[PDB]
């Protein structure tokens, strides 16, 4: 469900610039909180007045010592400052001098802007010469509740329309729910593309007109005043689902349930319409043909049969089975079967084309699993892989897929920019950065740059990562599990959690050799970088890099 | 719709070289507009005559001082030049000397070529020893109009063919439209693969013969002279759509409408042919079997029934529903049902195989949207992403897809060459290059090279792009929206439109640190490059690079 | 089939650390096998006691000379060591001194741990102040045997349920097999996600309860005590296949056989249920309608017909053919046909959507073969390729695909890490590394790094690999086949197996030119590297690189 992000606390600055832009005004803006109260924005009108650019005027106190000149008096120079100290609408009565130097009869409309907090936040100087949400647990399940009673009305009113020429009271309860639905739509919030959120009743009622109220206003019209064709407006209650279509695509099985249940309603109406053709042609047809299948000539036949036989027909016709217990004969009867065969051939390709995809889309992980498995089984038979390695290929692949759900890690990150990519890896690698000792005395830029180059490698039982004689390119960190260290089949050491191993990069200044082996016991969790990846970041932060190597204590210097 | 590009104004030079190549001539060509009227092309015959190459002879005045020698007279050296000053066909009577040096009895056929402008454009020296278009608003909608009356004739003439053994006058109006169609095809333009456009009536009439006129000439033959089989030629009017097939693939819903409506015509003919089998076998069949369904024995049955029942059958047969209200019995009746089942099984796979794809191809953006969404929802459940970041992933992804329609930006550019790739990015980034100050005094090569390395990054509300302590690799430009600047949660500055921020690259000559943060308010539009990307271009243009840094005024030097 | 890897011999160390972690203990661990019996792990409690880190304490004898001080006595310093020499639970009664230096009343609980071997393996010092497998040839084929008798019961009990109101003895044999199935499930092993394997009867019986025994316990209940609805519990024997679903996805044709045979069982039950509707409505229906098709009014009709006609109906209904020899009429009859058409339209899309994919997934190699072939045949017609090269394109492509099965070599390796990637290439290139002379005196790290950069190139008959004048970038090795050497169409030399050719990299220290050509006779097998790829590895191992070039004898130095 789409819900737009709330407006930041400084968004009122955009509207004030937009307001005074509408007046064709000439002005500047200066903050109160900062040291000497410097300028924060100036419009193009102010640039034309003096001649200076935005860059030159910015980061300067709003007393503005450059605006002084020969003709600028000494007495009211104070009458610039004591307005920053006093706060009031007062036109300060003085000339100024431009960049190149020129006299002009200007006048400083000094203003202090004040917000809901009741404090002096921003200065501006013009020149002249009961509430309800839309993503709440109340509103969430109530859309499914609306959808149920829509399906109730959409089905049971065709039953009333065709056949009727406990139930009387319960149908009136559903009519009141739609009247309650309209009143609730006023106070609830909505999301404009630009205006991410908008609230309170001065603004919501305008959007509701000229949208989808004119259609829904017809739904809530049950007049009393024969002739049941007046109740055809209750079918337009179905439009409430069409407008809220994005809500009903959350779960995998829920989308299947809608396309399966709506398939019944398509048949249900056609069943009721098929029956209507039998009633409104009495001069031999299909109903008297049914009257011979079940011995009831004319008296009359059964109501329960007439609805079933019609539904049976329109299912048999639209499903493209085509029995012929019941089938058309007269002109209008065949015309219907042409319509049902034509829409049926369209529907049976359209609706079950999607449902055939939805089952494979629901079981999408296990679909690609077997294709990836057939690559491995072909790769085994192609190369002839023996048993000691056979186990390692299967168990790693089954551990890799079962853990990650066969999802590409970096393929998702490519779409996002580098700022939010770092924030994603910061969330995954929170267990190292926040908890460990050397990363605490560090700025936020250092954390993100490091977070990019980290790699969360997983190690199942008995996996030899690095061996004796190899080049220690990486420098590892152990988050969870329990990792061993061996050499010549003797247990040298064990490491649990929050531990480090590799080499320092200051002493050698070279690619150093390894000392011994390293193997996992449990399904251990660890992290990884490189020598080249680390140094390129650490050299950018020289004052941080001294703190890094001193505080960081590695459990094994491996030579 | 394919329409070839018009021939440039200097394409007549190709035909003149091609003309004098046909004579086995030996010649050169020289321009009038250029300073001293130098040579612009020479054929291989001239290279063989003297011995010099194209490179050596080119960029030399057509007086040709190298062609002089001992035997070349002084009096008629003027009689080379005053032809460039006088203009006439005159064989200049003199010898010349080759590269190595040799006498040969040559003769300069001096010519001034003149075009429609009526001016001296090009010199050549031979040696010896009511209109109509095809992509107009008139022709565009008239193809759809032709297609309608084709469908009118294609349907209503089978009705006349089978059943007939207001309407009399209106059918004759359609016959005249095809006669009008033929006359219009003469004056209209066409597109040869080589000849991009060709016009005026000397050349178009030759292509129309031996193309698709011989078939369309049969369409316009309504002779008066019984026997309605003479009107079978009106079915060949359907070929006018087959030739113009590329026109009817513009809209998404329009292709669906053709394949859906032609499906009816396939049934329509088979319905009329099914009826013809009933009439032309009278010795029990299907028509007398229908005469018992609706009580009409022989007198005769109804015409409206006979057409419907046949259409109902051929739909039921070809749609693969198979009712059996009406069905074959005699030899010829079954032979038809074998033909309809065989084509029906072929058609129901072929035509609705495409229509099943067309609905997913029409909703192709929203199809891949849900697959990309399932990657994110799996990625959320796989990593367990909390609420403050949960919003950022959804809102960025929904903003990114809704803005770009889920289209790859650079994937389209890869097919095109670097010249037109730069022209595409020049169109997108026109708002910076043409309007801003420093890019005005610049050549066209500088604009294209820069345009390649620009990146149009979009920033929704409250998006922190760069933070304090980070390395300012990029140098941004603000086109639209409104962007803030903060540090330690205090509003430092605001920027509107056509503004700049980053660092100068001359003072440091290093990767400098950042000063503070930067965040968006509105759905702001901005651009981006790199330090390495800029300098590699700027160093190629040293005289431009001095103008660049001086005129370019950045609003924030961020240290 | 998933089978987890067995626990290594040092996994009991994890449980001992986990045990003493549960006591809130403070301790260290030291090995017996290593030289001076140094420390191998210490918990965080020991780090807090003294103050030292893991890195500082590790790789130190467990006598611990740093733990001595002024107050540590000289007499019981021996009573640290002689426990390593004697072995017993004894609290060594002495103080110690921390990092900064401090007295504390501590007490060393000296322990020697001993395993099944009966030897002194590890020291610990606490401080205070009939069998059966599940992947055997017996169990493997017995799952297929269980599946057969499940299908026997699942089919033949509906036959007994509906119709019955040699066979008597044989059905009781199947009832005993399920009782045998339960007893076998106790002693057989299983695989927990964490616990890769678990055995012996103290631990297996707990998992079997609260899993899939409560359902299977109902299956083995054949009580004696009319009313055959008691045998409906035998349908729940079908659940034994649902739990063991991963077993039945091995072969390509085996998955097709299950989905094809289960399709019959879906019809089989519906056939038996369709028949039940005929029996249990006797007040005209479908059974008396059948009694007129085959002249048998009431007496009674045939049993063999009643089962076939029902099966014929439910096939005709669910397959979506829809004949109408037998078809519904009464209320309950149509309700069934609505249910069969609804599930039939769902099943015919779901089950045959997979089976349509399974045939193309079985013939998946030959599917992409023709698409790759159409690229080549288009590429031939697009460029117009003559006969001498035409043969080389076809024969290489047909040799490449037929050998490799159209599988990507490196695309499979990308998922695996660099350790196991090297192990895969070590298996493929075993014929060179183990057998040849220069690679014998080499460490394991040298073998893996080389193995990565090797490339198994195949050469069919008459393939010119390298020519005279070319740069010998690669350095080849001949494993199998027979390779020639030529220059100016004269036979210079021949090479068989385990041979080398290229250039030495020490003498030139440059990219040297080639001498002559090289061509294959048989379908030869060979390997390949590069000059840059080799030197980058060899420079890391300087002591190995001297042994490499001396022992390695190349058959042709080619200049």
């Amino acid at each position: 469900v789409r819900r737009g992000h709330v407006a930041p606390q400084n968004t009122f600055l955009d509207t004030i610039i937009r307001k005074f832009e509408g007046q064709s005004r000439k002005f500047i803006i200066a903050n109160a909180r900062v040291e000497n109260c410097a300028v924060i924005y100036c419009n193009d009108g102010f640039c034309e007045l003096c001649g200076y650019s935005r860059a030159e005027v910015m980061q300067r106190p709003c007393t503005c010592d450059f605006l002084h000149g020969p003709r600028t008096q000494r007495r009211a120079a104070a009458q610039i400052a004591q307005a920053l100290l006093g706060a009031e609408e007062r036109k300060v009565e003085i000339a100024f001098y431009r960049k190149d130097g020129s006299c002009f009869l200007c006048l400083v409309d000094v203003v202090p802007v004040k917000n809901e907090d009741g404090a002096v936040i921003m200065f501006i100087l013009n020149f002249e010469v009961w509430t309800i949400l839309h993503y709440s647990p109340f509103k969430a399940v109530w859309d499914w509740l609306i959808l149920l009673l829509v399906i109730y009305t959409a089905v049971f009113t065709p039953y009333s329309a065709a056949f009727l020429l406990p139930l009387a009271v319960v149908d009136l309860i559903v009519d009141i729910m739609f009247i309650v639905d309209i009143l609730i739509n006023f106070r609830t919030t909505y999301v404009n593309a630009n205006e991410e959120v908008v609230s309170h009743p001065g603004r919501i009622a305008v959007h509701y007109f000229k949208g989808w109220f004119l259609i829904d206003m017809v739904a809530a019209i049950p007049f009393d005043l024969l002739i049941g064709l007046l109740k055809t407006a209750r079918l337009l209650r179905l439009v409430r689902v069409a407008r809220k279509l994005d809500r009903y695509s959350e779960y995998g099985a829920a989308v299947l349930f809608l396309l399966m249940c709506t398939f019944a309603l398509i048949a249900h109406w056609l069943a009721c319409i098929w029956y209507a053709i039998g009633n409104m042609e009495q001069p031999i047809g299909w109903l008297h043909n049914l009257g011979d299948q079940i011995g009831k000539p004319y008296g009359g036949p059964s109501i329960k049969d007439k609805y079933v036989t019609a539904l049976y027909f329109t299912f048999s016709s639209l499903t493209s089975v085509g029995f012929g217990n019941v089938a058309p004969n007269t002109n209008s009867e065949k015309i219907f079967s042409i319509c049902v065969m034509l829409i049926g051939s369209l529907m049976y390709a359209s609706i079950f084309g999607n449902v055939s995809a939805i089952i494979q889309r629901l079981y999408s992980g296990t679909a690609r699993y077997h294709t990836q498995m057939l690559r491995v089984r072909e790769f085994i038979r192609f190369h002839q892989i023996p048993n000691p390695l056979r186990q390692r290929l299967e168990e790693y692949f089954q551990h890799a897929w079962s853990y990650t759900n066969g999802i590409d890690m970096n393929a998702v990150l490519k779409g996002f920019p580098e700022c939010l990519q770092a924030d994603i890896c910061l969330h995954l690698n929170r267990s190292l950065l926040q908890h460990c000792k050397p990363f605490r005395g560090a700025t936020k830029g250092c954390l993100r740059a490091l977070a990019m180059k980290f790699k969360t490698t997983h190690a199942p039982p008995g996996d030899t990562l690095v061996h004796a004689g190899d080049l220690l390119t990486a420098l590892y960190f152990i988050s969870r599990g329990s990792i061993e260290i061996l050499r010549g089949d003797v247990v040298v050491a064990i490491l649990g959690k929050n531990d480090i191993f590799g080499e320092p990069l200051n002493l050698y200044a070279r690619p150093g050799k390894s000392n011994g082996d390293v193997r996992a016991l449990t399904y251990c969790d660890l992290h990884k970088i490189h020598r080249d990846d680390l140094l390129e970041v650490l050299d950018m932060y020289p004052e941080f890099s001294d703190h890094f190597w001193s505080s960081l204590e590695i459990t094994f210097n491996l030579r």
Side-chain angles (χ1 to χ4, degrees), chain A residues 1-20 22-24 26-32 34-70 72-73 76-87 89-115 118-129 131-194 197-216 218-245 247-304 306-559:
Chain A
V1 186
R2 188 160 79 172
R3 50 190 182 78
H5 197 262
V6 301
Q9 60 259 303
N10 303 314
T11 50
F12 80 102
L13 300 173
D14 180 44
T15 54
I16 291 161
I17 296 157
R18 186 171 162 185
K19 183 187 169 187
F20 286 111
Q23 297 186 354
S24 81
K26 35 170 79 171
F27 71 103
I28 57 175
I29 317 185
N31 187 27
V34 75
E35 282 171 30
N36 304 327
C37 308
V39 172
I40 55 167
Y41 181 80
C42 51
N43 70 326
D44 292 303
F46 194 80
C47 298
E48 292 173 17
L49 179 55
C50 62
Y52 293 94
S53 66
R54 294 176 191 177
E56 295 178 310
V57 176
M58 282 281 288
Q59 308 184 322
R60 296 278 189 75
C62 67
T63 51
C64 293
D65 298 311
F66 64 84
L67 286 176
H68 279 292
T72 58
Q73 295 101 61
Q79 296 158 44
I80 306 156
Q82 278 195 40
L84 303 163
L85 318 189
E89 186 172 317
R90 55 230 327 288
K91 292 199 194 180
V92 184
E93 217 159 37
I94 198 181
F96 302 106
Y97 269 71
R98 295 194 181 78
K99 184 195 286 176
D100 70 320
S102 57
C103 196
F104 58 99
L105 186 86
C106 225
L107 186 54
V108 187
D109 183 30
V110 176
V111 185
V113 179
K114 299 189 180 184
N115 70 323
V120 178
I121 316 308
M122 307 297 178
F123 296 112
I124 298 176
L125 279 63
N126 199 341
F127 289 78
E128 198 71 35
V129 291
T131 51
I132 309 292
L133 300 82
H134 84 273
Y135 50 97
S136 185
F138 187 82
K139 181 56 175 292
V141 75
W142 188 58
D143 285 30
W144 296 84
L145 189 280
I146 288 158
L147 186 138
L148 190 68
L149 56 80
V150 164
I151 292 163
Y152 181 86
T153 50
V155 175
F156 279 85
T157 54
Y159 199 106
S160 302
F163 299 89
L164 274 284
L165 301 170
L167 190 66
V169 184
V170 74
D171 200 60
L172 190 62
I173 295 165
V174 178
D175 292 19
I176 296 167
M177 284 289 295
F178 288 107
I179 297 165
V180 171
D181 209 334
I182 295 160
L183 291 172
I184 293 161
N185 288 312
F186 282 102
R187 286 283 184 82
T188 51
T189 51
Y190 74 96
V191 178
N192 190 18
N194 301 321
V197 186
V198 54
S199 303
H200 294 114
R203 297 149 195 178
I204 302 166
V206 177
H207 180 264
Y208 203 57
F209 298 154
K210 200 79 182 296
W212 300 96
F213 172 61
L214 191 67
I215 305 301
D216 295 29
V218 176
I221 309 187
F223 37 66
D224 200 55
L225 302 172
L226 221 85
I227 307 171
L229 279 68
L230 296 165
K231 302 185 181 179
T232 53
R234 299 181 183 180
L235 280 68
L236 300 176
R237 292 157 167 177
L238 190 279
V239 177
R240 292 163 185 282
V241 179
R243 63 188 286 182
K244 293 166 183 176
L245 188 58
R247 175 58 65 79
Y248 309 114
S249 305
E250 283 192 325
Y251 304 101
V255 177
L256 182 139
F257 199 88
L258 264 284
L259 274 59
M260 191 67 181
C261 77
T262 52
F263 184 80
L265 271 59
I266 292 160
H268 200 284
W269 299 323
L270 293 167
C272 298
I273 293 161
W274 171 253
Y275 175 54
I277 296 159
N279 289 9
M280 303 195 177
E281 280 206 327
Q282 293 281 298
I284 75 189
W286 80 270
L287 202 77
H288 302 165
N289 194 47
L290 182 136
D292 301 2
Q293 290 181 38
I294 300 165
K296 295 195 176 70
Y298 27 92
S302 52
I303 303 106
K304 202 78 177 178
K306 282 180 263 180
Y307 166 66
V308 170
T309 189
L311 192 144
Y312 162 71
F313 163 71
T314 193
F315 255 82
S316 73
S317 194
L318 87 78
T319 311
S320 84
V321 179
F323 280 98
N325 289 127
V326 48
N329 284 306
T330 65
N331 294 341
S332 49
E333 285 170 29
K334 289 172 173 165
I335 287 163
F336 189 77
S337 192
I338 296 302
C339 200
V340 177
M341 286 162 60
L342 197 151
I343 198 175
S345 58
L346 184 61
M347 194 67 66
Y348 196 63
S350 186
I351 206 175
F352 284 117
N354 293 316
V355 172
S356 295
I358 287 282
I359 298 166
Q360 296 182 342
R361 183 167 146 188
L362 182 59
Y363 289 98
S364 182
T366 57
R368 66 162 168 281
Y369 174 71
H370 289 300
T371 61
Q372 287 179 308
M373 186 64 76
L374 283 170
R375 292 171 189 179
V376 173
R377 290 184 177 178
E378 282 174 314
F379 196 85
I380 292 153
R381 293 177 180 179
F382 182 57
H383 290 281
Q384 305 180 8
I385 299 170
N387 291 309
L389 222 170
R390 187 73 165 284
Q391 293 173 12
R392 293 193 173 185
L393 295 167
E394 293 172 18
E395 81 193 333
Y396 182 81
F397 176 68
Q398 286 187 341
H399 179 265
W401 181 89
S402 65
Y403 185 74
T404 66
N405 311 134
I407 300 165
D408 294 312
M409 192 74 176
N410 297 312
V412 178
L413 295 170
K414 290 160 196 174
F416 299 98
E418 293 192 324
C419 297
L420 302 178
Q421 279 184 57
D423 194 49
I424 291 157
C425 297
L426 179 54
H427 167 79
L428 296 169
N429 311 343
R430 70 198 159 182
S431 57
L432 303 176
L433 278 42
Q434 298 168 26
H435 300 260
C436 294
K437 297 177 184 179
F439 303 96
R440 300 189 175 179
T443 56
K444 295 179 182 177
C446 304
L447 300 170
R448 293 170 193 173
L450 289 166
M452 281 284 290
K453 308 194 186 183
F454 274 107
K455 303 178 192 181
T456 59
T457 54
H458 279 270
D463 279 43
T464 53
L465 298 170
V466 190
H467 299 261
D470 296 34
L471 300 170
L472 289 166
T473 56
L475 201 158
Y476 300 87
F477 298 108
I478 303 164
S479 55
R480 294 167 190 175
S482 57
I483 293 159
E484 303 169 299
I485 315 185
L486 302 93
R487 66 200 301 183
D489 301 11
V490 178
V491 178
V492 180
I494 305 167
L495 298 169
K497 302 189 178 182
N498 308 334
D499 287 301
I500 319 174
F501 66 98
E503 273 191 318
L505 279 52
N506 303 348
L507 297 167
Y508 288 109
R510 278 184 185 177
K513 283 191 180 179
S514 58
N515 192 32
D517 296 16
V518 50
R519 303 180 190 178
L521 286 171
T522 59
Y523 294 93
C524 301
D525 309 332
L526 62 155
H527 301 257
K528 190 185 172 183
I529 60 176
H530 287 283
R531 193 191 302 96
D532 298 314
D533 288 32
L534 187 61
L535 292 165
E536 287 173 34
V537 178
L538 268 283
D539 291 329
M540 304 304 88
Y541 311 99
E543 296 188 344
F544 178 58
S545 66
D546 292 315
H547 180 84
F548 185 79
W549 292 113
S550 186
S551 59
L552 180 134
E553 292 178 37
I554 305 166
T555 66
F556 265 88
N557 181 28
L558 301 166
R559 174 260 176 177

